[PDB]
Design a protein around this ligand. Sequence first.
Ligand SMILES: *[C@H](O)[C@H](C[C@@H]1CCNC1=O)NC(=O)[C@H](CC(C)C)NC(=O)OCc1ccccc1
Ligand SMILES: *[C@H](O)[C@H](C[C@@H]1CCNC1=O)NC(=O)[C@H](CC(C)C)NC(=O)OCc1ccccc1
Lengths: 300, 300
Amino acid sequence: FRKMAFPSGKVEGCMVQVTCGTTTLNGLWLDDVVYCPRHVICTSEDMLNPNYEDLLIRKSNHNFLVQAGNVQLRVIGHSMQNCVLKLKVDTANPKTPKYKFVRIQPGQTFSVLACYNGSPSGVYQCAMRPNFTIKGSFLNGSCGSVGFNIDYDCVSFCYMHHMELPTGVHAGTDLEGNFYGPFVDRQTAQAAGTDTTITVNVLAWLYAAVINGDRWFLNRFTTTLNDFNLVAMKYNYEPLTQDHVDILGPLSAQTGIAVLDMCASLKELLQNGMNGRTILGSALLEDEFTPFDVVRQCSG
Amino acid sequence: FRKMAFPSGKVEGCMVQVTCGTTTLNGLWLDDVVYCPRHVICTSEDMLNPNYEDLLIRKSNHNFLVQAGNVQLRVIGHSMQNCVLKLKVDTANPKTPKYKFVRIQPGQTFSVLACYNGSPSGVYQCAMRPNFTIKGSFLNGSCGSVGFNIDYDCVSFCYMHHMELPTGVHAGTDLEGNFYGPFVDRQTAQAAGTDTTITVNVLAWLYAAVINGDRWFLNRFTTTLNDFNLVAMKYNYEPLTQDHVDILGPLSAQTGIAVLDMCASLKELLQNGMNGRTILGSALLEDEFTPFDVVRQCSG
Ligand SMILES: *[C@H](O)[C@H](C[C@@H]1CCNC1=O)NC(=O)[C@H](CC(C)C)NC(=O)OCc1ccccc1
Ligand SMILES: *[C@H](O)[C@H](C[C@@H]1CCNC1=O)NC(=O)[C@H](CC(C)C)NC(=O)OCc1ccccc1
């Protein structure tokens, strides 16, 4: 059972290089609009305490160098929407896929196409942590790299990368420029909340495990929703609602294991640990597979 | 530190659907040639003990239904090269990337574009095990899905998926149709050798860990190449040669840690275990990152 990313093809043909002064980073070219982090306009000094309006006013269209591979793009318009810069260009992207912009909830997953100088380097699947960070692989220049889900032919862009934190975790925005979490595009010490495990994702993965013939963690015991949540809250697991239980229904019915019997299996792993054993070749409990990711991988 | 796959775009535009009788699977459309597993010609009954020459002789070009998205392709020629079928078609693939065919060594890594009915569903990074299997996510119809590395603009195709084994691991061929390992495209119980850990990959990942600020596993001790190998062979680790040490040189010089000091760190993890601790958020020792994968991710 592999952590699979979406095919990156449709997104690869939207990645452009954006330079403003010294600073270079990645932009997303959809229709006649390039989207990038607004901090492209900042010098290393500005990043400490920037007035973005004031900094942006000193910039004209011709200050923005947007390159797609070997072709230069002329900017005919620029605006700031929250923490993203929208550069209007002359040429609509011929490779623009059917797309929308979505703001995802904590615990949902997406594919990141990690880019450097408008050029894709690699793809991976990650989860939006309950504390609105991501544990990712982002070097300097990776900024403007985007997160996406693909439904049929439609790319849903959910994330654009802005910054790494002292923790080494990553913060960024939706494609409207609203940060996930309490974070600002400013170089100051910024605390992410205490992170919690995505309980509904872990259960989904225990169902994935059953389906793939790993059943050892299954026990005789059962439990209640309340009695479980009091174990969850102890072990910094996100509490389980009836919505979470209803979302797991397909997997419960597929394997013939009631959600609350699986919950009881989990308690004994949380209380007793793993005992040196593994589940789908993993010594830890995996929470970066949604119930939807598990069903889509198990049915293809 | 994420397990990153290559961007799949260039490979996505080469995936076609191939049907012969009832059996449907994926093909790779490069120039005027489609490549697929030869077992596309087998009925469920034939797969038990097939005479491929005899089965192929009963088939003519017009028996092979090759579809690319919504466009049908006429076959003007068919041949068997080892375990792959080469279908010559009228139309050269317009989306054919610069490509070559390579046979990789055990312990090397590649990206798999998992496909169903000629349509890409997802991408992941895996290693060719020392026993020439891969631990992958392949449902029925996934056959013909390909493994690849990307150097600059050049796709190097190394693997095509043929079969799952009783173990639940996966076997397949190079693009010339030669199986990795002792496996045959036949539905019989087939034993993979005892698998070993890719020692040079694990060391590369301990260097990745140091670079990313996780240094706890580092010890005062050192060791010798022989004294280490006698611990390696005990713990089913592939023995370490001077070639392996020379390949780790860049990472040794980058972090200022001699290979043999890292080897000594590893012994104490093999002998004492992990102690409930983690390294780059993993409770096990990771062997699916090559020294090349580590340097490319750490320099972008
Ligand atoms: C944008 O390219 C860059 C991405 C960083 C670089 C290291 N890892 C990343 O994810 N982001 C920034 O330069 C960003 C700028 C602020 C105005 C938001 N600051 C940032 O990431 O925090 C400082 C930092 C720099 C280098 C390593 C770790 C943290
Ligand atoms: C090709 O589409 C298919 C891929 C298998 C199906 C389950 N997981 C896979 O990787 N391969 C076969 O059907 C193959 C045919 C032989 C002639 C090589 N046999 C195979 O994979 O072994 C039997 C098997 C079937 C279903 C589940 C597990 C093993």
